[PDB]
């Protein structure tokens, strides 16, 4: 106590935020340490639960609903005055069960970035790209390259024809109705898989690779957010930020993220944190510092938002955001992201059919929660697997092959597997960055007693853990 530790992703303007801390230390004498750990969104909950963790954590609003439910977040109490300074849309994003849990910072959205010396006219539709690629392939270039390793980037396409995360009905989200295995999704994803089959794109393409490609002018287009602009400005590439291409006449639907800053419920400096955020970061001078390092896009503060609205890049950001859908901040979000992530990855690698991959993503997102530990794996399965109300039995569930002998625990609503990674991995591989331990969870009620007909209750989902190669 007597300082502030802050966590924020590595792709954000952490250097600018540390400057806002440099000022905060000068005026109050309290030192601010800004950190940018990898997987900090998965790590925060882990440390915060043990009383530890940073004072302030930065991330899109979608994670904070889970945090608040786990009791890891202190409630924020800004007065009516301070509230008027921020847009009502941004406050809604950080509200869970009728409470304010974090401070809205900026509004993010994925935009289409093109290099106009290469491509004066950006494609208005996705379909135009397969052909536009052949033309560029002719002169040692590629049409499009972006991060295929994160569902955040490929979702805008999948969600175009009618893909959605959770059905919002009657004023609430139905965590059992997930729209990832419908025709709209399959369409979007199928198109993406085709691109990789057509070799118009590489399945192993991730953030840095797509960044370096576009920044070195090796590709005409890329998809990314405001934070990316800083590095593209330094590469002195004549680029442009425009609306995302439409898929089958329908516009791409990106998830709208609202960069938020929460306060650790176990943080001893709650008052100090409230000061820094309200009275140092959320001001014209504070947001300016960060924005300069890495663009925040459309800031939540009305005063500094209007000053940046002139920027055509921000305008295109807002346009895509307008055509997109705000992320739910419900705790089931993480399950959703994992489900989709695994889906896209398996499909793109041709390891699964689009129809199968999105089928498993359906179950995963609804019924399954995977937790990856150092040498250990935890899989939690909803007993109401199908949503029929008929609870499955533990003996019917099976993790991995015969060698996998996990410790099985059974609650009223769940069945939990604790498995050793070494014992339970059916498949291991290496990516640019990652070691991937993979396995499957299986529900096989058979042999059954009655005549199994219509819908089959044999379900198999992918269980995967990805670890950074250091
Ligand atoms: O891809 C899954 C991922 O999506 C979002 O993460 C974004 C984040 O919102 C952006 O600020 C920036 O950091 O890019 C991220 C994707 O690499 C969700 O916020 C996150 O929960 C989810 O895991």
From Swiss-Prot:
It holds the Pfam family SBP_bac_1. GO terms for molecular function: carbohydrate transmembrane transporter activity; maltose binding. The keyword Signal applies. The keyword Signal applies. GO terms for biological process: carbohydrate transport; cell chemotaxis; detection of maltose stimulus; DNA damage response; maltodextrin transmembrane transport; maltose transport. CDD domains: PBP2_MBP. It is found in: Periplasm. InterPro entries: Maltose/Cyclodextrin-bd (IPR006060), SBP (IPR006059), SBP_1_CS (IPR006061). Keywords: Periplasm, Signal, Sugar transport, Transport. Its main location: periplasm. Disulfide bonds: none annotated. Part of the ABC transporter complex MalEFGK involved in maltose/maltodextrin import. Binds maltose and higher maltodextrins such as maltotriose. The complex is composed of two ATP-binding proteins (MalK), two transmembrane proteins (MalG and MalF) and a solute-binding protein (MalE). PANTHER family: MALTOSE-BINDING PERIPLASMIC PROTEIN (PTHR30061), MALTOSE_MALTODEXTRIN-BINDING PERIPLASMIC PROTEIN (PTHR30061:SF50). NCBIfam families: PRK09474.1 (NF007011). This is Maltose/maltodextrin-binding periplasmic protein. It comes from Escherichia coli (strain K12). The gene is malE.
């Amino acid at each position: 106590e007597g300082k502030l530790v802050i966590w924020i992703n590595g792709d954000k303007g952490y250097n600018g935020l540390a400057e806002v801390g440099k000022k905060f230390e000068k005026d109050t004498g309290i030192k601010v340490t800004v950190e940018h750990p990898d997987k900090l969104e998965e790590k925060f909950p882990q440390v915060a639960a043990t009383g530890d963790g940073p004072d302030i954590i930065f991330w899109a609003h979608d994670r904070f609903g889970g945090y608040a439910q786990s009791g890891l977040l202190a409630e924020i109490t800004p007065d009516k005055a301070f509230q008027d300074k921020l847009y009502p849309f941004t406050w809604d994003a950080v509200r869970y069960n009728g409470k304010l849990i974090a401070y809205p910072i900026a509004v993010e959205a994925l935009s289409l970035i093109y290099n106009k010396d290469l491509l004066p006219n950006p494609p208005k539709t996705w379909e135009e790209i397969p052909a536009l690629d052949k033309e560029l392939k002719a002169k040692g270039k590629s049409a499009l390259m972006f991060n295929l390793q994160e569902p955040y980037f490929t979702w805008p396409l999948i969600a175009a024809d009618g893909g959605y995360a959770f059905k919002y009905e009657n004023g609430k989200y139905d965590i059992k109705d997930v729209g990832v295995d419908n025709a709209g999704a399959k369409a979007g994803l199928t198109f993406l898989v085709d691109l990789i089959k057509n070799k118009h794109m590489n399945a192993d393409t991730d953030y840095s690779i797509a960044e370096a490609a576009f920044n070195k002018g090796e590709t005409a287009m890329t998809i990314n957010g405001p934070w990316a602009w800083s590095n593209i400005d330094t590469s002195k590439v004549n680029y442009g930020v425009t609306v995302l291409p439409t898929f089958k006449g329908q516009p791409s639907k990106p998830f709208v993220g609202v960069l938020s800053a929460g306060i650790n419920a176990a943080s001893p400096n709650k008052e100090l944190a409230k000061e820094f955020l309200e009275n140092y970061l959320l001001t014209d001078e504070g947001l300016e510092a960060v924005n300069k390092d890495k663009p925040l896009g459309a800031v939540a503060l009305k005063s500094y938002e209007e000053e940046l609205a002139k920027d055509p890049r921000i305008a295109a950001t807002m346009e895509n955001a307008q055509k997109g859908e705000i992320m739910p901040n419900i705790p089931q979000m993480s399950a959703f992201w994992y489900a989709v992530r695994t889906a896209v990855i398996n499909a793109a690698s041709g390891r699964q059919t689009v129809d199968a991959a999105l089928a498993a993503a359906q179950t995963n997102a609804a019924a399954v929660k995977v937790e990856c530990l150092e040498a250990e794996l935890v899989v939690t399965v909803s007993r109401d697997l199908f949503g029929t109300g008929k609870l499955v039995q533990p003996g019917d569930l099976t993790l991995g092959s015969e060698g996998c002998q996990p410790r099985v625990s059974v609650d009223t609503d769940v069945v939990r597997f604790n498995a050793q990674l070494h014992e339970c991995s059916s498949r291991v591989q290496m990516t640019k960055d990652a070691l991937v331990y993979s396995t499957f969870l299986l529900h096989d009620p058979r042999p059954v007693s009655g005549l199994s007909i219509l819908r089959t209750n044999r379900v198999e989902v992918p269980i995967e853990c990805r670890y950074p190669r250091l």
